[PDB]
Amino acid sequence: AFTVTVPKDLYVVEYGSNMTIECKFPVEKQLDLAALIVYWEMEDKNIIQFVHGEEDLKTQHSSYRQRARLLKDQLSLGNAALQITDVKLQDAGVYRCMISYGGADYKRITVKVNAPYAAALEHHHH
Amino acid sequence: AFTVTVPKDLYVVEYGSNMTIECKFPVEKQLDLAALIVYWEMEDKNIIQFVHGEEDLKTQHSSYRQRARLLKDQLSLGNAALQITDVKLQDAGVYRCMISYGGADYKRITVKVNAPYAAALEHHHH
Numbered sequence: 001a002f003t004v005t006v007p008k009d010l011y012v013v014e015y016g017s018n019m020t021i022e023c024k025f026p027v028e029k030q031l032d033l034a035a036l037i038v039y040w041e042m043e044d045k046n047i048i049q050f051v052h053g054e055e056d057l058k059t060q061h062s063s064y065r066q067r068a069r070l071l072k073d074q075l076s077l078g079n080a081a082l083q084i085t086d087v088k089l090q091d092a093g094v095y096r097c098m099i100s101y102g103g104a105d106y107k108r109i110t111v112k113v114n115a116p117y118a119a120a121l122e123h124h125h126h
Numbered sequence: 127a128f129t130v131t132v133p134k135d136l137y138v139v140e141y142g143s144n145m146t147i148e149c150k151f152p153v154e155k156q157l158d159l160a161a162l163i164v165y166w167e168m169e170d171k172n173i174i175q176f177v178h179g180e181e182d183l184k185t186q187h188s189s190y191r192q193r194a195r196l197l198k199d200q201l202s203l204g205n206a207a208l209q210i211t212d213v214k215l216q217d218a219g220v221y222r223c224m225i226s227y228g229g230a231d232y233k234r235i236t237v238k239v240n241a242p243y244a245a246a247l248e249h250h251h252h
């Protein structure tokens with residue numbers, strides 16, 4: 001049946017760098033954007049929600065506006081790639097990619113953030 | 127928009143009893159079992175996958191084999207009813223019903239399990 005896959009179920013990224021998290025789903029010939037739903041989430045916070053060709057910004061969590069982007073070029077290749085810029089320790093956790101495209105599936109991804117002591121200390125105080 | 131709703135987001139159950147957890151979804155005009163996808167989950171363990179007309183269970187977790195079923199005749203009324211028989215302390219946690227029906231939404235449901243000392247002891251010690 002319709003199956004979402006990830007080339008990587010674990011990412012280890014460096015504090016302050018950018019990460020792109022990949023999420024593949026089958027596309028026959030070309031994408032029908034009006035049939036597509038892409039839901040990126042991270043432990044119960046909505047990061048991105050792409051419904052039938054355009055994103056719903058009313059539900060996006062404030063922490064991810066201005067840092068999260070759905071690479072819509074990769075959408076047509078069947079790759080719902082999430083890009084987070086300026087990765088912080090609070091971005092460590094479990095991510096879920098959910099696609100509805102004539103069928104529905106989801107996959108989990110775990111992000112670990114390596115950080116130097118100064119950055120961990122500031123996060124530690126908050 | 128396609129909204130999934132729950133009449134209750136919290137269930138309290140007695141150890142060893144049966145629980146039936148409910149998710150409602152909008153059925154516009156006649157139910158098209160072909161376009162319906164239902165996932166029941168609990169702390170990222172898969173309980174049920176209902177993919178276009180039938181139950182997929184080769185992805186169903188151990189902890190719910192022989193105990194979980196989707197109440198299929200409720201589907202016509204827009205009701206994704208998950209029934210767990212022989213409820214155990216480890217059934218406590220946060221559940222998720224995820225529904226794809228020409229729109230996609232999920233809701234969370236917390237379950238608490240009351241239990242007598244002995245049941246709690248065996249589960250605590252394991």
Ligand SMILES: O=c1[nH]cnc2scc(-c3ccccc3)c12
Pocket residue numbers: 037038039098099100104105106163164165224225226230231232
């Ligand atoms: O459940 C959701 N909620 C919000 N968006 C989306 S896109 C795809 C899904 C989905 C639904 C059921 C099973 C597998 C995936 C989904």
